[PDB]
């Protein structure tokens, strides 16, 4: 029930701005400080920014200080990170995290726990671009091998993150998503496969639901032989 | 600043055995309150890391009873008591004694099981796929063991070099196996230039190479 649900990833160019958002439920939010982690392939996880619970006292890490601010308001329960003057290095998944609480008469440890689930932020000159998706399909070959694989290939898109569901999430078991390659293009590339019975290949429907926020799509593929 | 240092940073492990990873920071961690901040998280694949120990030795809500945390000053350890399967994961180390909060650069838990032979399959292009500029073949291996593996294209009967990728999951949670997919892109033009497609698939688990194949059309 303690739960962060962080919102407002996605791409800027170069000096531009974001502000990323993380909502708070289940608990007293007024009551604890909070903080902003991120993290990137190269540099592992980097604490950005602390902010105390009434949202008077702030700090940040020198990588980013004078170009990123941290915010709360209480009564919407909401923590607020202001990105200003962007950097290419920049570009990471950006955490919020809970941490000291505090008390009538005195303040307890230090933490960061629990985190919310994580936004990606892009800096870059590119442009955004939506995915293709193209079904990954068998043919009506192996019969007597008794597990068939299908999947989607979803092309070209930028920037990252793409999410890749089957039949609304409820196909879950044997799925397997690939971490996405970025191509000589500039453009990223992945599939998503899953394993079903050959007994189910015109038995039951399959369909890849492939998110791709950054450009504003949700493309549904069923996939047929 | 303070220096988070951890080893060892793989871990190869046999289900059932004990797992211990160290921390090692650089500068004593004890707060003027009298509690060290030291914590430990896991992390899976696309998920943010979740926290299992913290304050060197005290377990989070809810975390199973086999992890356990111990040590003092600047030299710190996580422990497993019998790893399942489920303990598969980047681990770090982090510090909350001092701003700025630093972390370790996280150790690999990699879980030893039983050799698998990849199930190998090949998808040949979309019809779809044609009338844009370019054509992907995608050829996956599916739940094997270990993650050591060979993919070689051939067109035609031919060996094909410099137009292939390779994607790898991380070892699953559940049955410990990876997966791999090899994607072959060609312009429009030369996918029509060839009838042939095939991958050939060469693993530990496999007594001789596995070769899958389709004919354009």
């Known amino acids: 029930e303690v739960q962060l649900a962080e919102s407002g990833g996605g791409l800027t160019k170069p000096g531009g701005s974001l502000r990323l958002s993380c909502a708070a439920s289940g608990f007293t939010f007024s009551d604890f400080y909070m903080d902003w982690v991120r993290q990137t392939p190269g540099k592992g996880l980097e604490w950005v920014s602390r902010?105390?619970?009434?949202?008077?006292?702030?700090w940040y890490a020198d990588s980013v200080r004078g170009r990123f601010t941290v915010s709360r308001e209480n009564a919407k329960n909401t923590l607020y990170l202001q990105m200003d003057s962007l950097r290419a290095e920049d570009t990471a998944v950006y955490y919020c995290?809970?941490?000291?609480?505090?008390?009538?008469?005195?303040?307890?440890?230090?933490?960061?726990?629990?985190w919310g689930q994580g936004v990606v932020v892009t800096v870059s000159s590119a442009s955004t671009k939506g995915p293709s998706v193209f079904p990954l399909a068998p043919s009506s070959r192996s019969t007597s091998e008794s597990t068939a694989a299908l999947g989607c290939l979803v092309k070209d898109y930028f920037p990252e993150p793409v999410t890749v569901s089957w039949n609304s999430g409820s196909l879950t078991s044997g799925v397997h998503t690939f971490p996405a390659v970025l191509q000589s293009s500039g453009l990223y590339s992945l599939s998503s496969v899953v394993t079903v019975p050959s007994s189910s290949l015109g038995t039951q429907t399959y369909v890849c639901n492939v998110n791709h926020k950054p450009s504003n799509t949700k493309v549904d593929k069923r996939v047929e032989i | 600043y303070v220096v988070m240092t951890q080893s060892p940073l793989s871990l190869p492990i046999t289900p059932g055995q004990p797992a211990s990873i160290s921390c090692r920071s650089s500068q004593r961690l004890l707060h003027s309150d009298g509690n060290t901040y030291l914590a430990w998280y896991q992390q899976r694949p696309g998920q943010p890391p979740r926290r299992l120990i913290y304050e060197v030795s005290k377990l989070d809500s809810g975390v199973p009873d086999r992890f356990s945390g111990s040590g003092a000053g600047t030299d710190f350890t996580l422990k497993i008591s019998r790893v399942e399967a489920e303990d598969v994961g980047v681990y770090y180390c982090?510090?909350?004694?001092?701003?700025?909060?630093?972390f370790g650069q996280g150790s690999k838990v990699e879980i030893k099981r039983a050799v698998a032979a990849p199930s190998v399959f090949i998808f040949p292009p979309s019809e779809d796929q044609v009338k844009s500029g370019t054509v992907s073949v995608v050829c996956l291996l599916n739940n094997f063991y270990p993650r050591e593996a060979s993919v070689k294209w051939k067109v035609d009967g031919v060996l094909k070099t410099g137009n292939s990728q390779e994607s790898v999951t991380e070892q699953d949670s559940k049955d410990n196996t990876y997966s791999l997919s090899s994607t072959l892109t060609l312009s429009n033009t030369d996918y029509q230039s060839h009838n042939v497609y095939a991958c050939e698939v060469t693993h530990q688990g496999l007594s001789s190479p596995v070769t899958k194949s389709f004919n354009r059309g």
């Open positions: 995290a809970r941490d000291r609480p505090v008390y009538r008469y005195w303040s307890g440890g230090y933490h960061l726990d629990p």
């Open positions: 982090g510090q909350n004694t001092y701003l700025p909060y630093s």
């Open positions: 902010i105390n619970n009434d949202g008077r006292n702030k």
